[PDB]
Amino acid sequence: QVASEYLGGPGGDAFDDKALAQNGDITRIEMQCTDVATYIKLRYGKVDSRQWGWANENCIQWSKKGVKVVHELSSGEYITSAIVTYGKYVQSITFKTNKRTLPRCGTSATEKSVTVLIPGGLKYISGRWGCRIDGLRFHAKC
Amino acid sequence: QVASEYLGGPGGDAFDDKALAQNGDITRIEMQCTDVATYIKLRYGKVDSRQWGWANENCIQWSKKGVKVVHELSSGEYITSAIVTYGKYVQSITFKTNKRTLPRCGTSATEKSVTVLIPGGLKYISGRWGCRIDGLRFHAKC
Numbered sequence: 001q002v003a004s005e006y007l008g009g010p011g012g013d014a015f016d017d018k019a020l021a022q023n024g025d026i027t028r029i030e031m032q033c034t035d036v037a038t039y040i041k042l043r044y045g046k047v048d049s050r051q052w053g054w055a056n057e058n059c060i061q062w063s064k065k066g067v068k069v070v071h072e073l074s075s076g077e078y079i080t081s082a083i084v085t086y087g088k089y090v091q092s093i094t095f096k097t098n099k100r101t102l103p104r105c106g107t108s109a110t111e112k113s114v115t116v117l118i119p120g121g122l123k124y125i126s127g128r129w130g131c132r133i134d135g136l137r138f139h140a141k142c
Numbered sequence: 143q144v145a146s147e148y149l150g151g152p153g154g155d156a157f158d159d160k161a162l163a164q165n166g167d168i169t170r171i172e173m174q175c176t177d178v179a180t181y182i183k184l185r186y187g188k189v190d191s192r193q194w195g196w197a198n199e200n201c202i203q204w205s206k207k208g209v210k211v212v213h214e215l216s217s218g219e220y221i222t223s224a225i226v227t228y229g230k231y232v233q234s235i236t237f238k239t240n241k242r243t244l245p246r247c248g249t250s251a252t253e254k255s256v257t258v259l260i261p262g263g264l265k266y267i268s269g270r271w272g273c274r275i276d277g278l279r280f281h282a283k284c
């Protein structure tokens with residue numbers, strides 16, 4: 001088991017997709033994206049996780065909601081890196097796969113930025129969520 | 143395996159330690175360091191690479207030379223982060239391991255900076271070299 005540092009802060013509630021990943025490779029990314037990323041929801045084989053973020057419509061009181069973005073992954077497509085900007089929360093995420101680069105979720109990229117290599121491809125994520133994505137940790141197929 | 147983007151420029155000649163890295167984990171880092179890093183040379187298990195940089199002493203016409211810096215890694219110690227400043231060439235390299243942060247090689251850090259995280263540890267480097275380190279790419283273990 002290989003995993004990155006946790007990137008983000010202590011708000012929200014912890015989540016962990018470890019068990020759900022026993023379904024198989026990530027086949028889809030769903031996010032909600034505005035000036036910042038407000039939720040993430042990956043699909044492991046055929047099974048989605050819960051929506052990790054945008055806990056309720058009342059969250060408009062603290063950030064914009066944004067637009068739902070989906071990337072359906074093709075067979076043999078694996079997420080191999082993530083550019084993350086973060087501070088108190090995850091601000092923006094830019095995934096790259098072994099087949100293509102994907103657009104950034106979160107138009108603002110002003111906080112500290114790191115490029116996380118994800119050896120063997122991303123296996124699953126853990127982190128913290130509430131009205132947005134408080135933090136993420138990337139667990140690799142290695 | 144998964145790799146970072148290529149950081150640097152198109153000068154020099156390509157090198158790639160992939161085949162050498164079959165000989166083992168990185169056990170040693172050697173660099174030549176002045177205001178910029180002028181060469182890099184890793185050891186994989188017991189097997190040293192060629193000196194990637196400072197092709198000859200007349201290279202002093204185009205940059206300073208620097209001092210030789212050796213870091214021996216303990217068993218189970220691996221490089222989990224590389225902060226690189228770069229443009230036309232690699233300017234500076236700051237390696238962090240799971241045990242300690244190593245000093246920057248290259249006292250000047252004025253060029254574009256990137257922080258590459260390598261969960262599980264760096265496996266090997268590739269890049270381009272001549273009088274100095276034209277560029278580097280970081281390869282993970284899977």
Ligand SMILES: OC[C@H]1O[C@H](OC[C@H]2O[C@@H](O)[C@H](O)[C@@H](O)[C@@H]2O)[C@H](O)[C@@H](O)[C@@H]1O
Nearest residue numbers: 152153154155204271272273274275276
């Ligand atoms: O590795 C750097 C560089 O090394 C050799 O070039 C040395 C210098 O050549 C001068 O002609 C030039 O004006 C300088 O900019 C170069 O640093 C090597 O031949 C070259 O390919 C490399 O980029």
